Amino acid sequence: MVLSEGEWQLVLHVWAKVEADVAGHGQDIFIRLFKSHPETLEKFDRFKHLKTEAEMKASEDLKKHGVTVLTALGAILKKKGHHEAELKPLAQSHATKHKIPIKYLEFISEAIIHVLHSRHPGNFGADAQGAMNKALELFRKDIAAKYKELGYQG
Numbered sequence: 332m333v334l335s336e337g338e339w340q341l342v343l344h345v346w347a348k349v350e351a352d353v354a355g356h357g358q359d360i361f362i363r364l365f366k367s368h369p370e371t372l373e374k375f376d377r378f379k380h381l382k383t384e385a386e387m388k389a390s391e392d393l394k395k396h397g398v399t400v401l402t403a404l405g406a407i408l409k410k411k412g413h414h415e416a417e418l419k420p421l422a423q424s425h426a427t428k429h430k431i432p433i434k435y436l437e438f439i440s441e442a443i444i445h446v447l448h449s450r451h452p453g454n455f456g457a458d459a460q461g462a463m464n465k466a467l468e469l470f471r472k473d474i475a476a477k478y479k480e481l482g483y484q485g
């Protein structure tokens with residue numbers, strides 16, 4: 332797929348709001364993910380002992396990890412589709428070290444869209460949500476193609 336510039340504009344306009352509090356957005360997203368799809372928590376050896384949302388919010392390691400993840404995602408979105416280099420090391424570690432299936436990348440995509448919708452309703456109407464969804468579908472389709480080249484296609 333190819334997003335138009337107007338779509339990329341809608342995505343970087345709400346992303347600029349997220350960047351005003353990257354650590355708080357990271358927490359909300361991961362908490363939403365772990366609550367909605369508990370199986371994804373099992374993939375994290377560092378965090379799978381966390382039993383409640385209260386424990387998750389209080390985890391300083393989880394908040395540092397959410398900042399790492401959103402920073403890497405933001406760098407990919409700011410490329411506007413020219414993200415081949417950024418995607419390489421990310422696809423290698425998620426396919427060969429962490430073993431994350433594409434279906435889990437759909438689950439975090441849903442969590443990102445839920446949290447933007449809750450926190451940024453004015454900058455996340457139907458058109459802006461449709462553009463963010465297109466941008467995350469492009470990221471998932473490109474990562475899935477790299478998984479296949481690396482031998483995992485999971």
Ligand code: HEM
Pocket residue numbers: 371372374375376377396399400403404420421424425429431435436439
């Ligand atoms: C927006 C999608 C994602 C992005 C941009 C992303 C990014 C990252 C980054 C930048 C790291 C640190 C360096 C590395 O190991 O590569 C990381 C680690 C990791 N990611 Fe992801 N990730 C994504 C989705 C997921 C999903 C959905 C899962 C699991 C369901 C996953 C599981 C992990 C694991 C197990 C680690 C190691 C964490 C730790 O112990 O340090 N990632 N991810």
